[PDB]
Amino acid sequence: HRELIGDYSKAFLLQTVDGKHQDLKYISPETMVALLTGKFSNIVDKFVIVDCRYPYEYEGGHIKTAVNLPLERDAESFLLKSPIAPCSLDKRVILIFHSEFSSERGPRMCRFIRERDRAVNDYPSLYYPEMYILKGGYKEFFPQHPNFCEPQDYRPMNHEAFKDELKTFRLKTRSWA
Numbered sequence: 001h002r003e004l005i006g007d008y009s010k011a012f013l014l015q016t017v018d019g020k021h022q023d024l025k026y027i028s029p030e031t032m033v034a035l036l037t038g039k040f041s042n043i044v045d046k047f048v049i050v051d052c053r054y055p056y057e058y059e060g061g062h063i064k065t066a067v068n069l070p071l072e073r074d075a076e077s078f079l080l081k082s083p084i085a086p087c088s089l090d091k092r093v094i095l096i097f098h099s100e101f102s103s104e105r106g107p108r109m110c111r112f113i114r115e116r117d118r119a120v121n122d123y124p125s126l127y128y129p130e131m132y133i134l135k136g137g138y139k140e141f142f143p144q145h146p147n148f149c150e151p152q153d154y155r156p157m158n159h160e161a162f163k164d165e166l167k168t169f170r171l172k173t174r175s176w177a
């Protein structure tokens, strides 16, 4: 009972929960685990978990199999230089973006990739028609499913010991207010 995925080919596969960006689709930690455990494997050929946090955050504990792509230029290169395509036409590729709380950084990246994907395709085709945000980010995922994380820990962006690493990262970004 929702709208189609972004190339209007079919419905969203995963059950979604409410999130503050009302036009994006959010999933729970339980759904993320369903992907990781192959619950959807007959249909989902590939999925990419895009950890949008800074490298020190990712190094302090991330979801197994996640890729750390906090800079837009790096996310664009990884995802769109040579798009990640299912090995059967019957099957799907899904992207899941998250950040610490999935408040700002994850949603931002999700939108950016959609804008890029639209730009490089003939409307309405997309390389990544089906993208989700992990509701509550790493902060909510880790306490529920620690064995799906490595290392089994959680390093916040504003960790007191990583103030320098935060500044170092910010000076690599393409724009700030």
Ligand SMILES: N#Cc1c(F)cc(O)cc1SCCS(=O)(=O)O
Pocket: 006, 023, 024, 025, 110, 111, 112, 113, 114, 115, 118, 131
């Ligand atoms: N932006 C954005 C966006 C996205 F990243 C994933 C998604 O499921 C929906 C949206 S808002 C609609 C943008 S568009 O009409 O698909 O180009």
